[PDB]
Amino acid sequence: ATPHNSAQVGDFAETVLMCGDPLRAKLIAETYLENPKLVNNVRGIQGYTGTYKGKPISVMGHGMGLPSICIYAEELYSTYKVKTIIRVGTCGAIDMDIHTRDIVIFTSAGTNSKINRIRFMDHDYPATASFDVVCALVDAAKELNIPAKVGKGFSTDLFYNPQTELAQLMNKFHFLAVEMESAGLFPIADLYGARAGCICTVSDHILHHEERQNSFQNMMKIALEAAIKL
Amino acid sequence: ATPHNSAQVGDFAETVLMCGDPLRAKLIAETYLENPKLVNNVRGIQGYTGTYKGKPISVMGHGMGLPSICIYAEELYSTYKVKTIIRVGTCGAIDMDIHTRDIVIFTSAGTNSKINRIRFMDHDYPATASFDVVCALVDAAKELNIPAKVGKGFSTDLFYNPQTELAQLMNKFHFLAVEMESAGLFPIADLYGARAGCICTVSDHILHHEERQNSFQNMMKIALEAAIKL
Amino acid sequence: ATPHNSAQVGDFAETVLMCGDPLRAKLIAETYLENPKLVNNVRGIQGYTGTYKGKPISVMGHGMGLPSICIYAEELYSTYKVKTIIRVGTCGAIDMDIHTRDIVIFTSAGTNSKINRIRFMDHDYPATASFDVVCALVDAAKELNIPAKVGKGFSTDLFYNPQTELAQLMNKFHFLAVEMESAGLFPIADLYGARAGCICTVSDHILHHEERQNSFQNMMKIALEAAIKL
Amino acid sequence: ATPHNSAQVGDFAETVLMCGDPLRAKLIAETYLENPKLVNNVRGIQGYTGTYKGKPISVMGHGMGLPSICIYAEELYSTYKVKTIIRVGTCGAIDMDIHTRDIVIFTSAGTNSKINRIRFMDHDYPATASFDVVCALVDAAKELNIPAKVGKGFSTDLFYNPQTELAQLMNKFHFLAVEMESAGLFPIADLYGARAGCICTVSDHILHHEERQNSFQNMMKIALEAAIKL
Amino acid sequence: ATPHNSAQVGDFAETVLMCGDPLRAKLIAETYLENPKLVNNVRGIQGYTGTYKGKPISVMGHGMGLPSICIYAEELYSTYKVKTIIRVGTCGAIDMDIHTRDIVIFTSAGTNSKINRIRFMDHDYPATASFDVVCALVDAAKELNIPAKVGKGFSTDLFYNPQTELAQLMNKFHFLAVEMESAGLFPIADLYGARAGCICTVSDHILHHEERQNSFQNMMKIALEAAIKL
Amino acid sequence: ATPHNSAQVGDFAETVLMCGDPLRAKLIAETYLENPKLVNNVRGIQGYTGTYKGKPISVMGHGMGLPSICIYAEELYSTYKVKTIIRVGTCGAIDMDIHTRDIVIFTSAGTNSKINRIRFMDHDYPATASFDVVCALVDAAKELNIPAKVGKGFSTDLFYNPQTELAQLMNKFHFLAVEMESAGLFPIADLYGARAGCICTVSDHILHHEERQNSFQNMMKIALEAAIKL
């Protein structure tokens, strides 16, 4: 019922997992959901809804960047009355102690975007992950006993960042990893009194380049279980 | 050879047409190119290369938003040595005299993004379309005798814009239409001494909602011919 | 050994509780610590160190505003090798569902300050509370079974804010309460690979004015116990 | 009928050529217009109106800087119902391939001014030259067969720019030349649904100092003829 | 010896009076200086040097806007080793208690320009008038017993200001009058360890429109005498 | 009658001297005022009112930073109808010619705060000291024949400033000293049609570290006498 979604209210579960890659979503739909049904494929976005441990859960792509994820997340909350959105995906390690394949759970996300300043009267909005979702994720990691780091992430507008010193600065402040959507996502969830969260598997390290599926599967378990808890 | 493209240098034509929808690109690939070959489908992006009037031309999706298109455009220029990128797609009419289905050729694009300020020492960068591409497009429209408006466009970071007064302001300054990529695209082309341009078919009017394929096909002709001229 | 502290390295415990009022700190020192010794009273700041359940703990005032708390927090981390700083105090309720006397635990803090933009290359820094401290506080509340809300806070530079619409905006985004130090505190902790956190008792509601000690004592228990856990 | 103009509605032609130097305008008035009549000399601005190939055309000085040209341009459009303003003058080459005496036709103009952000809700306004005026100028150059470069210009607020790195940055993005008025001019034309344009003769190169009248006369021909076409 | 001045080092007095209008400067040169000699008329700027009470003093136009006055002032300080520049001219009353024809002596000048933020690491630079010049002016007014108000002025980049609420805001903060050069002037004087100052005669009131030469002559006396004192 | 003051309207003199240190205020109260009575000690702020040469005068602490002093100053003007506030204290020398123990009288104060931009529609507000207070202070210094420098000061939000180049920049523009309150103070005085001023004794030099009471006492005399004059 939207310019980017053909699904009707009800086609989506209250809990939706999203990742940038629409093909990764199709994969997750096939691989982890039982009886998954494609509910929306506008712009080949790959929107499915199935079940996990009997619970209804949807998975869909969100593209790259805060602008993209902002369209989808706002529609899902606003139109499809989705209650929870967990962002699963990859990212770039920033902190030196964070290594490739390490799983990271965002508490918050910084950004070089202007979106939040535009929504927050040009002030500093703390793009924070829903504490419930952060707890469910961390609990799920604990229960599964899957090591994972928890802290700040960075949603960059520039994948190829001209400001080469930013990386180092972030390291000094111990930002865990960098991606391109969380910062835009979190505030939207707030606006709708809904919940948002993010957990990514470090695909590489930006401050020095250093089996990769096991990490993805582990991140996916942590996410799926946390969804049940939510 | 990139994190978002599997194609090797050479798989892409010097002139590439891009649109947000990866399915629209597949459609254009099938519909308008002869012997199209999928050169890249990372993130289901839908990258093809074929020929038109015997000339090599590629078509690929670029997602939504300056962050997304910025990744692709930079890689195509930088890695695949693409010389020209024409953005074809839809947009929202802003000016009152601009109506749905009207075809628009961007001279430049404004934005509420921070990307260009980040690349231009926090100054006003005039995200301008390559004059060659603007000429080729306008000439193609003239030759084909297909009416089309030429002027400013707006690349919004917020599809659903909280600043409801912006629309009206843009109308006062006669911005033709609003989309989500041009502003990011144009400066990247400049940086690489390459060429960029945009031509969109107004899918709707934001200041008041007011066969749609004929307009698309007309926009597509104007673009394809302009590519030959380029 | 500083321009604002006479105490020598060692006079402060690894865990320090701070509040704006230097008299409140003296009160907490007397009331909750055993054998408290005034370690610093430069600018009548009221710095004490004593014990709680046998563990060493310091309490000191931090003044009002990010500039003030930024001087103290940086010195404590940098010079006195303090590992944890929990901010205890009052605040103004913003969210409609938050009421006077309700205890609030900050996950993060937004701000209309420029400090963080100055430290973060003019980007959005997510002033986030240390997850360990947020957990210890929430666990302590759970163990003590003392209801408390957890979410975003706002560190205003303007106690008397000229931008009368901000309050309402924050309510729309569900900011829990507003104070004047957290936002400055959190990033400094990050810079020093240390920990920071905040828990305040809502002294009033800014969107409509609506025994007060019981709430303070409850907040104080939650804080003291969380400190032991840390 | 204004604080900066004594001329009454009608004293100015629909097409007005302006340059910073009021003496250059007097020169152009004498040299290129037939039967020129001084219509305004408030602040010795040097406003004339005469004819060229029988068509009415005015020439006047506009001072230096966006603030100055903004006063004049707004009055001419608003009060004297001027339809077209072509800015003729000098500038500093920025691009390495651009040399002294080269004639440049602006497509758009960037700036380190705050004026446009003030008129555009603190967003990036693409100070673009009217496509009609850009075409008329380029056509006139083509018809006259006078080589001229077409691209971005920069309207600096600081002739003596403290940010010594800006120049180099602009070169990387291939800005053609730098002046001090276009950026302010273009948006005003838009606001009045009128037309603006600029064509300057490079008086020097800022990135390395490298008969000068022939270039001026050529630029002047291109401008005068383009005016007839407009 | 500059792009905007033909005079050689020595042609200008250590103390220079400047006003926007080049014709007003010629008038002041003729009217108030003995044996005035035109030292520079590039861009018809009208630069003279003569004597007053036997002391050498120059008068020259500076155009409109911070960009214009910034070129001249920097050259005069830098190249012509001018020690003092007093800005004389007109302005618009802002404060309700300030009336047309009232003479105003600026202590400082605010602005909506970006120039000073560009010179001051994007911080708030207090564009302040040299205390010596402010004293000399106020003393001269006192000695001459010519009533004059002393306080903040505003250097606008937009003579025709789109932000119609600014005026009222300035009134609330009691800004005395608005012009277009001081704010740019003052910081340049600082940079050169030189002196700058401003004294204007209110030509009109912006918050409500309410012999005019007597006021000008009085302002001129105050300025000339203050120059002798300097 | 405020959240930070228990004194009732009348407990404060029309002229109030404030310094960061609440203990310094108590000292000044004891040392320089006759029959001083503590009127407010909320947050141990140390508010006294006594007499000097028979005239009523109050002294109180204001904490550190613009946020802190902004709360107090606004309440004193607004609630306690205070007419004049003179800020006395310490500061850091910036200018090379300014030495430790030198007394400085602020004409204005720059800042890296965002407070004034928040009160001034994101424009440059010239945080200027009341000319009456600047005169009274300078006259008092002259009468007492106590050397003192007069010029720009800087109110930093970051005592420990990350932007290590700022210091040098300020030196180039000849900023006299740096503190943390003036910039916030001055504009508030304006808003209330009241008067504010500042005079500090340089406790150290930031660009190179170089009996200290004599300087303080001298600064205190200058202030007390200026208060009588006011």
Ligand SMILES: Nc1ncnc2c1ncn2[C@@H]1O[C@H](CO)[C@@H](O)[C@H]1O
């Ligand atoms: N190093 C990285 N930088 C930015 N985005 C990353 C990175 N690694 C993975 N991503 C994610 O994948 C896409 C960018 O390639 C975005 O969806 C982003 O969130």
Ligand SMILES: Nc1ncnc2c1ncn2[C@@H]1O[C@H](CO)[C@@H](O)[C@H]1O
């Ligand atoms: N009205 C509109 N606003 C923003 N983007 C639009 C609009 N219409 C079409 N688009 C385009 O389609 C996507 C947004 O739906 C983006 O790729 C954008 O360029």
Ligand SMILES: Nc1ncnc2c1ncn2[C@@H]1O[C@H](CO)[C@@H](O)[C@H]1O
């Ligand atoms: N409503 C409020 N607004 C701002 N600060 C508050 C509020 N309530 C309590 N505070 C706290 O007390 C002081 C402001 O009175 C600061 O230390 C601040 O953190």
Ligand SMILES: Nc1ncnc2c1ncn2[C@@H]1O[C@H](CO)[C@@H](O)[C@H]1O
């Ligand atoms: N190099 C340059 N930099 C800025 N302005 C220039 C330059 N060359 C010529 N100009 C023009 O002349 C004046 C500045 O000397 C302005 O009108 C400006 O447009």
Ligand SMILES: Nc1ncnc2c1ncn2[C@@H]1O[C@H](CO)[C@@H](O)[C@H]1O
């Ligand atoms: N009301 C006003 N607004 C802006 N500038 C003014 C005003 N009155 C006089 N001026 C001065 O005259 C010119 C603007 O007309 C500038 O030099 C400016 O300093």
Ligand SMILES: Nc1ncnc2c1ncn2[C@@H]1O[C@H](CO)[C@@H](O)[C@H]1O
């Ligand atoms: N060098 C300095 N930098 C900042 N503030 C200073 C300095 N010296 C003294 N101060 C003052 O003392 C406190 C900072 O230590 C603030 O009240 C501030 O005004």
